[PDB]
């Protein structure tokens with residue numbers, strides 16, 4: 001591990017004077033530098049500093065959450081400085097408490113202190129001065145996921161030390177005090193909490209376009225060779241933005257020949273929020289745990305659905321699609337494919353999904369589930385720079 005410190009020290013020299021020059025540097029040279037600093041921190045640190053760093057992260061997020069809630073970030077102008085006293089008068093809060101929590105963010109570099117008594121925003125804190133997907137993600141992480149993680153030791157004593165699956169008795173619902181409610185029922189308990197999750201999830205809206213990654217002209221051929229045939233069925237496709245993004249790309253394949261499927265309540269909202277003559281696919285309310293209604297489509301897409309469920313439930317879902325598929329049909333599973341071992345962010349998400357009854361999977365775990373549903377994996381397209389993939393499956 002001698003040369004690891006040198007690859008990073010040579011990467012911190014490249015980034016060093018690109019700052020002094022002001023010239024931007026490649027998008028994925030920032031991500032390798034980000035990864036190196038983490039790993040080096042891992043090497044140099046010992047368990048004592050690990051615990052201190054972890055505890056500092058919890059205090060930092062607590063200060064972030066409170067100063068957001070108290071509108072303190074709003075009260076700090078985006079440029080220039082303001083005194084702690086003036087901030088405290090603006091938000092009507094004890095200047096001593098404002099100062100102590102601000103000092104946490106000064107010490108970690110989220111805020112900057114000027115002199116003995118003035119505070120100012122940095123690039124790292126400006127997103128928290130308004131409502132947007134980043135500040136929503138901050139709030140959701142703290143209000144939703146942190147209590148569930150904290151409750152896990154007691155959860156696994158209570159329910160047994162096994163992977164948690166199932167709609168009721170989630171770690172989340174247990175941590176909320178009502179293990180009989182589903183996560184949907186709980187986030188619906190207050191339309192403000194529902195609104196934050198919706199805004200927060202907008203950050204992953206654009207995600208990884210199926211349009212650029214997958215060719216689809218073979219579907220157009222089928223669309224031309226059979227102009228009577230269901231083309232693309234988006235199983236659990238929510239708003240159908242994936243489907244629309246595809247069909248402008250594919251000349252002989254039009255949005256009107258595709259089918260957006262989701263729960264009836266979701267489909268009804270699609271209807272009520274669409275402009276009168278907008279071009280639209282067919283809309284079908286349905287339950288993908290039951291028989292697939294559209295038979296013989298060219299492509300079935302199931303994107304970011306299977307990770308919410310156990311292997312057994314995924315086999316049920318996929319078996320319904322396999323039964324509806326024809327011999328030339330393709331099923332595309334859009335999911336993270338964990339490496340063994342997984343990356344830091346995907347392992348993080350794997351445990352967050354456990355709090356709601358889901359999991360991320362390796363390609364071996366997908367293969368087991370796909371085969372049990374009477375399918376086989378023909379290929380995988382993996383996004384550049386990450387692990388989110390489209391797994392191309394066909395009838396076995």
Ligand SMILES: C[C@@H]1C=C[C@@H]2CCCC[C@H]2[C@@H]1C(=O)c1c(O)c(-c2ccc(O)cc2)c[nH]c1=O
Nearest residue numbers: 136137138140141200201204304307335336349
């Ligand atoms: C937006 C959310 C709010 C704050 C969290 C803080 C940062 C880590 C996770 C964030 C959360 C989040 O991103 C979530 C996901 O990405 C997914 C997700 C999981 C697998 C996928 O193939 C695609 C998306 C599921 N459920 C989430 O909640």
Ligand SMILES: C[S@@+](CC[C@H](N)C(=O)[O-])C[C@H]1O[C@@H](n2cnc3c(N)ncnc32)[C@H](O)[C@@H]1O
Nearest residue numbers: 236237238262263266286287288289303304305
């Ligand atoms: C994580 S969202 C994925 C949305 C879309 N596929 C995308 O990539 O953004 C999961 C979707 O599955 C839908 N869903 C959950 N259970 C379902 C079911 N039993 N039948 C049909 N759709 C379901 C939800 O309404 C939601 O729109």
